[PDB]
Structure 1
Amino acid sequence: NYQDDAELATRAIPELTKLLNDEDQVVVNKAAVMVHQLSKKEASRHAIMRSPQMVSAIVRTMQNTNDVETARCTAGTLHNLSHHREGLLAIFKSGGIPALVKMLGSPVDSVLFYAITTLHNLLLHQEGAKMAVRLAGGLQKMVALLNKTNVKFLAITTDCLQILAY
């Protein structure tokens, strides 16, 4: 947090949450792109994860939006939070497991990359996740996935099923 830093991200997060919550879906897209870009840097990533309102705004937005870009950035943000115990937990608290489970619907290959690996990280590391995912319909969704997606996802998808049943 000395070249490109937490202090800044922390200062920007409220302004950005408010943008993600906007009625105007174009503004929402701009802010989703930014939150995605911040999520890419270790320092600012942590500022995102310590923000409950930010994380919920990212989860709502991912579920609601019709714009592929917003979906890709928003799921990518979550994918990035999911590399840290704190981010896993934040996704859990925000209602992201069902949100992510819906995204396993998406045609877009990068959106579903993000949803599947985030879920997988959750299944591996987050307490409550297996049951959360089962309760959201996760097993059916992942069997559907497995049966329709390309080779990049067969392994991770099959690892998720194996976790959800042992």
Structure 2
Amino acid sequence: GNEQIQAVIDAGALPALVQLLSSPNEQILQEALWALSNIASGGNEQKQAVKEAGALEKLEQLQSHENEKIQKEAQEALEKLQSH
């Protein structure tokens, strides 16, 4: 829902994500993509987490990563950060 991220973000999503967002293991990185995007799409400036993680640049980068699965979801993660 909404306020579960509030707990996840505190539990320490970043300690894992900061490392494995560069993971060579598809299953891991593709999962991390959704784990990141699902928390980043929160509220109360929940998206700050991605900024502290510095995953923004990874995302933009991963968008041109040969693996299309990652490529597509890498940009999906940006959608959670952006605001129109």
Partner of 1:14: none
Which of residues 22, 25, 44 in structure 2 aligns to 1:105? 22
Q: Any conservation in 2 of the 1:123–1:130 contact (CA below 8 Å)?
A: yes
Task: With the length of structure 1 as denominator, give the TM-score of the two structures.
Answer: 0.43
What is the Cα deviation at residue 111 of structure 1? 0.4
- Residues 117 and 149 (structure 1 numbering): CA distance in 2 closer, same or farther, change over 3 Å? farther
Of structures 1 and 2, the one scoring higher in RCO (CA 8 A, sep 6+) is 2
SS of match in other structure, 1:154: helix
What is the Cα deviation at residue 129 of structure 1? 2.7
Q: Any conservation in 2 of the 1:104–1:145 contact (CA below 8 Å)?
A: no
What is the Cα deviation at residue 136 of structure 1? 1.8
Q: 1:85-96 maps to which residues of 2 (within 5 A)?
A: 85-86=3-4, 88-96=5-13
Instruction: Verify: 1:157 aligned to 2:74, yes or no.
Output: yes
Taking only aligned residues, the RMSD between alpha carbons, in angstroms, comes to 2.3
Which runs of at least 4 in structure 1 moved beyond 6 Å after TM superposition? none
Number of residue equivalences: 83
SS of match in other structure, 1:91: helix
Which of residues 35, 41, 55 in structure 2 aligns to 1:118? 35
Partner of 2:46: 129
Q: Any conservation in 2 of the 1:146–1:154 contact (CA below 8 Å)?
A: yes
Task: With the length of structure 2 as denominator, give the TM-score of the two structures.
Answer: 0.75
The residue type equivalent to 1:109 in the other structure is: E
Structure with the larger helix share: 1
CA distance in 2, matches of 1:84, 1:163: 14
